Design an enzyme around this catalytic site. Structure first.
Site, PDB file in Angstrom:
ATOM      1  N   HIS A   1      31.641  51.867  11.795  1.00 17.64           N
ATOM      2  CA  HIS A   1      31.328  50.501  12.169  1.00 17.64           C
ATOM      3  C   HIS A   1      32.544  49.685  11.826  1.00 17.64           C
ATOM      4  O   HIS A   1      32.730  49.263  10.683  1.00 17.64           O
ATOM      5  CB  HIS A   1      30.066  50.021  11.395  1.00 17.64           C
ATOM      6  CG  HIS A   1      29.579  48.661  11.787  1.00 17.64           C
ATOM      7  ND1 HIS A   1      28.547  48.017  11.134  1.00 17.64           N
ATOM      8  CD2 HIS A   1      30.000  47.808  12.755  1.00 17.64           C
ATOM      9  CE1 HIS A   1      28.362  46.824  11.671  1.00 17.64           C
ATOM     10  NE2 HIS A   1      29.227  46.678  12.662  1.00 17.64           N
TER      11      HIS A   1
ATOM     12  N   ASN B   1      33.043  37.396  14.631  1.00 21.92           N
ATOM     13  CA  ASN B   1      33.568  38.556  15.347  1.00 21.92           C
ATOM     14  C   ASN B   1      32.949  38.818  16.733  1.00 21.92           C
ATOM     15  O   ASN B   1      33.133  39.911  17.255  1.00 21.92           O
ATOM     16  CB  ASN B   1      33.468  39.784  14.446  1.00 21.92           C
ATOM     17  CG  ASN B   1      32.069  39.999  13.939  1.00 21.92           C
ATOM     18  OD1 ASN B   1      31.121  39.571  14.584  1.00 21.92           O
ATOM     19  ND2 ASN B   1      31.923  40.644  12.757  1.00 21.92           N
TER      20      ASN B   1
ATOM     21  N   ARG C   1      23.067  47.246  16.875  1.00 25.06           N
ATOM     22  CA  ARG C   1      22.579  47.884  15.648  1.00 25.06           C
ATOM     23  C   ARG C   1      22.106  49.282  15.973  1.00 25.06           C
ATOM     24  O   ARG C   1      21.478  49.497  17.023  1.00 25.06           O
ATOM     25  CB  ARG C   1      21.446  47.073  14.984  1.00 25.06           C
ATOM     26  CG  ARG C   1      21.894  45.828  14.182  1.00 25.06           C
ATOM     27  CD  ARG C   1      22.783  46.271  13.016  1.00 25.06           C
ATOM     28  NE  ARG C   1      23.259  45.166  12.193  1.00 25.06           N
ATOM     29  CZ  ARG C   1      24.459  44.610  12.340  1.00 25.06           C
ATOM     30  NH1 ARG C   1      25.278  45.039  13.284  1.00 25.06           N
ATOM     31  NH2 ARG C   1      24.840  43.613  11.563  1.00 25.06           N
TER      32      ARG C   1
ATOM     33  N   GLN D   1      23.818  53.041   7.188  1.00 29.66           N
ATOM     34  CA  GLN D   1      25.275  53.056   7.058  1.00 29.66           C
ATOM     35  C   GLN D   1      25.684  53.073   5.586  1.00 29.66           C
ATOM     36  O   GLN D   1      25.151  52.300   4.790  1.00 29.66           O
ATOM     37  CB  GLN D   1      25.890  51.828   7.780  1.00 29.66           C
ATOM     38  CG  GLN D   1      25.663  51.862   9.285  1.00 29.66           C
ATOM     39  CD  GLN D   1      26.484  50.848  10.077  1.00 29.66           C
ATOM     40  OE1 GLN D   1      26.595  50.980  11.288  1.00 29.66           O
ATOM     41  NE2 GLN D   1      27.017  49.808   9.405  1.00 29.66           N
TER      42      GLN D   1
HETATM   43  N1  LIG Z   1      29.449  45.954  15.990  1.00 29.23           N
HETATM   44  C1  LIG Z   1      29.728  44.831  15.150  1.00 29.23           C
HETATM   45  O1  LIG Z   1      30.621  44.878  14.316  1.00 29.23           O
HETATM   46  C2  LIG Z   1      28.890  43.633  15.313  1.00 29.23           C
HETATM   47  C3  LIG Z   1      29.336  42.242  14.991  1.00 29.23           C
HETATM   48  C4  LIG Z   1      28.363  41.211  15.478  1.00 29.23           C
HETATM   49  C5  LIG Z   1      26.987  41.603  15.905  1.00 29.23           C
HETATM   50  N2  LIG Z   1      26.627  42.905  15.975  1.00 29.23           N
HETATM   51  C6  LIG Z   1      25.269  42.483  16.298  1.00 29.23           C
HETATM   52  O2  LIG Z   1      25.067  42.031  17.605  1.00 29.23           O
HETATM   53  C7  LIG Z   1      23.996  41.037  17.562  1.00 29.23           C
HETATM   54  C8  LIG Z   1      24.366  39.981  18.457  1.00 29.23           C
HETATM   55  O3  LIG Z   1      25.429  39.207  18.056  1.00 29.23           O
HETATM   56  P1  LIG Z   1      25.613  37.820  18.707  1.00 29.23           P
HETATM   57  O4  LIG Z   1      26.816  37.180  18.086  1.00 29.23           O
HETATM   58  O5  LIG Z   1      25.695  37.905  20.212  1.00 29.23           O
HETATM   59  O6  LIG Z   1      24.363  36.958  18.177  1.00 29.23           O
HETATM   60  P2  LIG Z   1      23.582  35.902  19.048  1.00 29.23           P
HETATM   61  O7  LIG Z   1      22.471  35.313  18.176  1.00 29.23           O
HETATM   62  O8  LIG Z   1      24.484  34.839  19.594  1.00 29.23           O
HETATM   63  O9  LIG Z   1      22.920  36.682  20.253  1.00 29.23           O
HETATM   64  C9  LIG Z   1      21.704  37.336  20.181  1.00 29.23           C
HETATM   65  C10 LIG Z   1      20.832  37.203  21.379  1.00 29.23           C
HETATM   66  O10 LIG Z   1      19.726  38.047  21.316  1.00 29.23           O
HETATM   67  C11 LIG Z   1      18.631  37.355  21.848  1.00 29.23           C
HETATM   68  N3  LIG Z   1      17.397  37.926  21.314  1.00 29.23           N
HETATM   69  C12 LIG Z   1      16.824  37.972  20.115  1.00 29.23           C
HETATM   70  N4  LIG Z   1      15.719  38.727  20.248  1.00 29.23           N
HETATM   71  C13 LIG Z   1      15.614  39.147  21.530  1.00 29.23           C
HETATM   72  C14 LIG Z   1      14.671  39.930  22.199  1.00 29.23           C
HETATM   73  N5  LIG Z   1      13.539  40.438  21.476  1.00 29.23           N
HETATM   74  N6  LIG Z   1      14.823  40.204  23.495  1.00 29.23           N
HETATM   75  C15 LIG Z   1      15.901  39.705  24.143  1.00 29.23           C
HETATM   76  N7  LIG Z   1      16.825  38.939  23.536  1.00 29.23           N
HETATM   77  C16 LIG Z   1      16.703  38.639  22.231  1.00 29.23           C
HETATM   78  C17 LIG Z   1      18.859  35.984  21.389  1.00 29.23           C
HETATM   79  O11 LIG Z   1      18.218  35.089  22.250  1.00 29.23           O
HETATM   80  C18 LIG Z   1      20.281  35.843  21.471  1.00 29.23           C
HETATM   81  O12 LIG Z   1      20.672  35.313  22.724  1.00 29.23           O
HETATM   82  C19 LIG Z   1      24.006  40.505  16.182  1.00 29.23           C
HETATM   83  O13 LIG Z   1      22.773  40.048  15.763  1.00 29.23           O
HETATM   84  C20 LIG Z   1      24.504  41.616  15.352  1.00 29.23           C
HETATM   85  O14 LIG Z   1      23.475  42.394  14.906  1.00 29.23           O
HETATM   86  C21 LIG Z   1      27.500  43.876  15.714  1.00 29.23           C
END
Ligand SMILES: NC(=O)c1ccc[n+]([C@@H]2O[C@H](COP(=O)([O-])OP(=O)(O)OC[C@H]3O[C@@H](n4cnc5c(N)ncnc54)[C@H](O)[C@@H]3O)[C@@H](O)[C@H]2O)c1
Ligand SMILES: NC(=O)c1ccc[n+]([C@@H]2O[C@H](COP(=O)([O-])OP(=O)(O)OC[C@H]3O[C@@H](n4cnc5c(N)ncnc54)[C@H](O)[C@@H]3O)[C@@H](O)[C@H]2O)c1
Lengths: 395, 401
Positions: free
Chosen positions: A336, A150, A288, A317
């Site tokens: 959400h 997603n 989150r 949640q």
């Molecule tokens: N609202 C929703 O329905 C929905 C769906 C997907 C994700 N979210 C969230 O969004 C987050 C991101 O999703 P994504 O697909 O882009 O995952 P992703 O792993 O591709 O991207 C996450 C990024 O965060 C970076 N990261 C981790 N720790 C970090 C830090 N301390 N400082 C800076 N950067 C850091 C990573 O390097 C990575 O590039 C997910 O982990 C998930 O929690 C919400």
């Protein structure tokens, strides 16, 4: 050990009016692959039709027939909260737990200790922070999620909420709904996005898709990440790199949070870091809920430090009925939902099946799907997470 | 008849209910240097306001009062615009210049224009002049001008916002969050991704092209029609699919955006007969003009499922009556008419209004791009984008509000 597993799957309730017998449209758009090349899920077969509601209790992620045909027990419930729940009772002997972040079955240290047989915690969706990763690592439990399923959906949602906050969409719609007109009341708080500076914390799959969608809006684009993007991508999008998120905040009219939840990012938005924001800054948080101290956001809205806050994620949640973000001014909140649109569900239902097929046949789960495997952070987990426990306060 | 001092009649919307703000959410506005395509920003001699102030309401006065009174003009500002005895219609009989905004329009009907003995200039502070009967203006030798491109980009942003809002089911989902619910399945039973959908635009003008450019990175298929075809280079860069008529375009589209002005060619172009051409569960976003769409035809298509949503900020007439059916229909993303009047946009059309007035009173020609009607005919932007006729029919229902 044994060859037959108990699969425990927590899903959200059907619509209040019942499981739908019809939908708004005939088909979903065809998507060939993800940006950057990761292929769509490849299960051997699927038992659902794309566009159907799969994430609620009657949908069952289309898994029942496959699981039972292989002699496994498949338990589906929406009752997840408390020691008294169907979930916690069934949890003791479950080999596999499946839940979605939209209706999360929290695997706290205590619950994981009770789950004697737990071998796999599978997120149907993205982000595993509702599972205590340190406990999983210590127990040799595999934690997996359907990576990129997603990410693009959420990126659309982010841009929508950014525009909604800056242009003052929600209060304006209320006036139209109530029989008003009240132009001045609407635009007294309304600006164009054009020329503003937007920062992203994390350009990962969602963050980068957000930056790509913002580029034609003629904003200035800033970002930070654990891992820097290639120069070619930075030049193409005119990205301005920052070494830390705190160096970035004072530059931004709008800040969007795209980073996973783990001890490094927990409550990264708090009374102290909000002082770095411009007066009238906007925050969009689709990552989150617990990235933001709940009361600090409210105080910043009331003082005028923030001109708006929007996002679809809360902690815990479901959000309690009295959760303060529900009633604060200048909010763009939804429950959400962004990662569970009908388009997205077809993808994570397929990915869920692919991960299970691999798991029960003793084949390796795709590295990009892995968070924790074999006693350590692995795959996407090694890349995007840090060891620790983010489930504190979920009760 | 001829003298150096004018009566300027200026219709503006009311102040906020709580009073006129002296402070704003932020310190200043982003700097905008020019428009895409090269038209320069307004060039008044000076401005008497700070960009970011509320200028379009009665206490704001578009920042014009000091400049006008210093030159001996009479400046009357009112929000009372609807009905035969409104302050507007009483002051109109001897006004030389009428100014209004489309958001709170002072309709210049044939009847009203016939009563305005001194009217030489109808000035739109904003874009679109359909609240003026252009045929009457033409016949009377009245100049009609508007501040072209002033909010085009603001509206394109509003369009993308509403497309995403309809497709992703934003409004009903927010309602659940506010009322204390969670209700995921109720939200997403109507919720889709935009990615992969087909979006058509009727008119790629200043707004239409800006919308197409903003939609390109969402990885949708882009279709359009217009009176004038875009250059091949532009079609190629955006992967645009051209259609000669809007009716040829509709069956291809998951989403249709209306970016065309209102005149007899476009009036009620969305109606029961053309709606039969749309795919099931289609979305329409209309930020152009309310009267492009038969209002009851829209309601019927929403109730039948022919449309999965309708959104826009424009209504007919304006203000919309309290019982206007678009206020209560399901699957709507409506706002009052605000998109072209953000604080950023107001700074530009206030400056543009002042520029046009200065030209008019100094006897210099008004910029061609600002002209709709001049010297007894469609001219400038008017010749390019309009057709002669009267679109103000039925506007008296506004007095109901
Ligand atoms: N609202 C929703 O329905 C929905 C769906 C997907 C994700 N979210 C969230 O969004 C987050 C991101 O999703 P994504 O697909 O882009 O995952 P992703 O792993 O591709 O991207 C996450 C990024 O965060 C970076 N990261 C981790 N720790 C970090 C830090 N301390 N400082 C800076 N950067 C850091 C990573 O390097 C990575 O590039 C997910 O982990 C998930 O929690 C919400
Ligand atoms: N919601 C708002 O606040 C707001 C602000 C600006 C305008 N609108 C409206 O949007 C309209 C467009 O604004 P713009 O800046 O893009 O103006 P524009 O003149 O640049 O574009 C208009 C386009 O419509 C085309 N056109 C005229 N008649 C047509 C027809 N019969 N069929 C197809 N195309 C036709 C023209 O060729 C032109 O490309 C305005 O007239 C105005 O009514 C809304």
């Amino acid at each position: 050990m044994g060859s037959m597993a108990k699969i425990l799957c927590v899903l959200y309730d059907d619509p209040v009016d019942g499981y739908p017998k019809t939908y708004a449209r005939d088909d979903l758009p065809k998507i060939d692959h993800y940006p950057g090349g990761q292929t769509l899920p490849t299960p051997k077969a699927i038992d659902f039709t794309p566009g159907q509601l799969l994430g609620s209790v009657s949908g069952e992620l289309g898994l029942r027939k496959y699981l039972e045909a292989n002699g496994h027990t498949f338990v589906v419930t929406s009752d997840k909260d408390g020691p008294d729940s169907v979930f916690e009772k069934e949890l003791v002997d479950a080999d596999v737990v499946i839940s979605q972040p939209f209706w999360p079955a929290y695997l706290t240290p205590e619950r994981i200790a009770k789950a004697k047989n737990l071998k796999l915690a599978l997120t149907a969706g993205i982000g595993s922070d509702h599972v205590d990763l340190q406990s999983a690592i210590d127990r040799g439990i595999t934690v997996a999620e359907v990576t990129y399923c997603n990410s693009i959906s959420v990126a659309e949602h982010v841009v929508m909420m950014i525009l909604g906050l800056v242009r003052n969409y929600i209060p304006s719609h209320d006036w139209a709904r109530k029989g008003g007109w009240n132009i001045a009341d609407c635009v007294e708080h309304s600006y164009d996005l054009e020329g503003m500076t937007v920062g992203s914390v994390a350009a990962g799959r969602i963050g980068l898709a957000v930056l790509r969608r913002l580029a034609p809006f003629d904003v200035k684009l800033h970002y930070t990440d654990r891992h820097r993007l290639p120069e070619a991508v930075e030049k193409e999008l005119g990205l301005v790199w920052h070494d830390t998120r705190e160096d970035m905040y004072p530059h931004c009219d709008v800040v969007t949070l795209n980073v996973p939840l783990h001890p490094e990012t927990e409550h990264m938005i708090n009374d102290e870091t909000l002082k770095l924001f411009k007066r009238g800054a906007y925050i969009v948080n689709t990552a989150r809920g617990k990235l933001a101290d709940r009361d600090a956001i409210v105080r910043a809205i009331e003082s005028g430090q923030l001109a708006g806050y929007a996002g679809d994620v809360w902690f815990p949640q479901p959000a309690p009925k009295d959760h303060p973000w529900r009633t604060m001014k200048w909010e763009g909140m939804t429950p959400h939902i962004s990662g569970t649109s009908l388009s997205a569900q077809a993808r994570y239902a397929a990915g869920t099946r692919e991960i299970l097929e691999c798991f029960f046949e003793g084949r390796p789960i795709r590295d990009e799907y892995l968070i924790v495997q074999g006693g350590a952070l692995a795959g996407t987990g090694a890349h995007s997470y840090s060891k620790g426990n983010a489930t504190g306060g979920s009760e």
